[PDB]
Write a protein that binds this ligand. Structure first.
Ligand SMILES: *[C@@H]1O[C@H](CO)[C@@H](O)[C@H](O)[C@H]1NC(C)=O
Lengths: 49, 65
C-alpha cells in the first residue's frame, strides 16, 4: 500500500464485442414511453413503426 | 464444452422442428385420439412454443426414450 501510483495495483476489465453471421445474443437496453390513446401519433411497438 | 441453455394410445403429441438464419423454431399441439396404428384423419394447426437464437447447423437428429 506504500507504493507510488505507477507501482500500485490497478484492476482492468477489457470488454470485447463479437459480430458474425450468427444472431445477436447481446443488446443494449431499449427504453419505452408512456402510451397515448385517441390521438394521432407516431408509434413503435417491438420495432413495428 | 458448455454453451447457451434454457428452461421452460390415449393422446397424440405433434411437433414441428425447423432451422432458419440461425434460429431454431419449435411448434406443437396435443389432442385426444381414438386410433392406435396411424395419425388420426382431421385438421388442427400447431402453435409456436419457442424461437431460439442458437446459430448451430443441423443435418441429423434422434429421439430420447
Ligand atoms: C453453419 O454452416 C455455414 C456453411 O453452410 C457456416 O458458414 C457457418 O459458420 C456454420 N455455423 C456454425 C455455428 O458453425
Amino acid at each position: 500500500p506504500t507504493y507510488g501510483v505507477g507501482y500500485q495495483p490497478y484492476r482492468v476489465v477489457v470488454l470485447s464485442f463479437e459480430l458474425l453471421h450468427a444472431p445477436a445474443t447481446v443488446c443494449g437496453p431499449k427504453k419505452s414511453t408512456n402510451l397515448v390513446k385517441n390521438k394521432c401519433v407516431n408509434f413503435n411497438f417491438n420495432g413495428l413503426t | 464444452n458448455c454453451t447457451f441453455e434454457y428452461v421452460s394410445f390415449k393422446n397424440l403429441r405433434e411437433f414441428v422442428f425447423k432451422n432458419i438464419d440461425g434460429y431454431f423454431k419449435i411448434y406443437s399441439k396435443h389432442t385426444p385420439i381414438n386410433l392406435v396404428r396411424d395419425l388420426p384423419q382431421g385438421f388442427s394447426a400447431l402453435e409456436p412454443l419457442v424461437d431460439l437464437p442458437i446459430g448451430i447447423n443441423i443435418t441429423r437428429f434422434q429421439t430420447l426414450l
